[PDB]
Design a protein around this ligand. Structure first.
Ligand code: IRD
Length: 293
């Protein structure tokens, strides 16, 4: 039932090596580029799938070309069996890297520097008029080259939504929008099946950085969406910051002030990370936790 078999060649150029990811809505393969001789990510969608999502993912990827923390676009195409996108292959995701740490925690140095890169990638996708809507550690992957191995990349626009109309205006929110993303990092707004905004992506970032620094979130043992939302709705969020830099209160208060319509203050959040690093003498040039150094 895999869409492409091993050694299958796409457009006489991209040869399937193995499947590296799968879901309801498509599959991702590591392929060899028979022209350039590097390996690539080959993402495919069945031609016969009711929800045709990959054309939107490619439109977003193309709008982001030239930004940092974005996979290079290599090509795309469509035939009678599948649609496909070829993109730059990335490496280890942050969820696997965090689980590989002794106590499931990153240092504050690693946490804050990742936070700056993730924030940049979130502002970038927002700047081209899209919400990610499933910001989570497994959707960020470190690079796999000398030129990229300390760079963090945003993956999987499969749940993204355009929040502007054709002429650049904010579009009306639906009175109910079914939240179909991952439970652990979902905002209270997403839990309430409210239309998601730019602020909800920054809620996911907030929850991610607490889990990175502390090793856990209070609801991590609860998989049920409704239960987790009821736990978050009451949870005293300042408690999440007991063992975090005090600047994080400025981040919490700012995102708690936002609504669907309000452009976030990305700079205020960036300065929380930069001030937290400067207070603690954390340098940009520092080793990440997973490096020998
Ligand atoms: C960002 C643009 C797009 C087309 O929406 C996507 C994706 C995607 C969705 C699910 C995925 N799942 C995976 C990857 C991956 C990528 C992946 N991908 C790339 N480029 N290296 C490495 C990996 C890691 C292997 C798993």
């Amino acid at each position: 039932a895999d869409i492409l078999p091993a050694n299958y060649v796409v457009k006489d150029r991209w040869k399937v090596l193995k499947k590296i990811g799968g879901g309801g809505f498509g599959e991702i393969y590591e392929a060899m580029d028979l022209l350039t001789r590097e390996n690539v990510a080959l993402k495919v969608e069945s031609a016969q799938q009711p929800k045709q999502v990959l054309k939107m993912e490619v439109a977003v990827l193309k709008k982001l070309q030239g930004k940092d923390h974005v996979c290079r676009f290599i090509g795309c195409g469509r035939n009678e069996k599948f649609n496909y996108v070829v993109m730059q292959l990335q490496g280890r995701n942050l969820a696997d890297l965090r689980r590989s740490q002794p106590r499931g925690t990153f240092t504050l140095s690693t946490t804050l520097r990742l936070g700056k890169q993730i924030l940049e990638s979130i502002e970038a996708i927002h700047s081209v008029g899209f919400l990610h809507r499933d910001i989570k550690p497994s959707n960020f992957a470190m690079g796999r080259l000398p030129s990229t191995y300390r760079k963090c990349y945003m993956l999987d626009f499969g749940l993204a939504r355009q929040y502007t109309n054709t002429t650049g205006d904010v579009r009306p929110p639906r009175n109910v929008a079914g939240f179909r993303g991952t439970v652990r990092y979902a905002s209270v707004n997403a839990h309430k099946n409210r239309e998601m905004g730019r602020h909800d992506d920054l809620w996911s970032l907030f929850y991610m950085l607490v889990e990175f620094a502390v090793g856990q979130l209070p609801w991590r043992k609860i998989k049920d969406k409704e239960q987790v939302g009821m736990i978050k709705e009451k949870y005293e969020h300042r408690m999440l910051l007991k063992h975090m830099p005090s600047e994080f209160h400025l981040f919490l208060d700012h995102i708690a002030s936002l609504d669907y319509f309000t452009k976030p203050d990305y700079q205020l959040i960036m300065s929380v990370f930069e001030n937290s690093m400067k207070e603690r003498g954390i340098a940009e040039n520092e080793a990440f936790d997973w490096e020998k150094a």
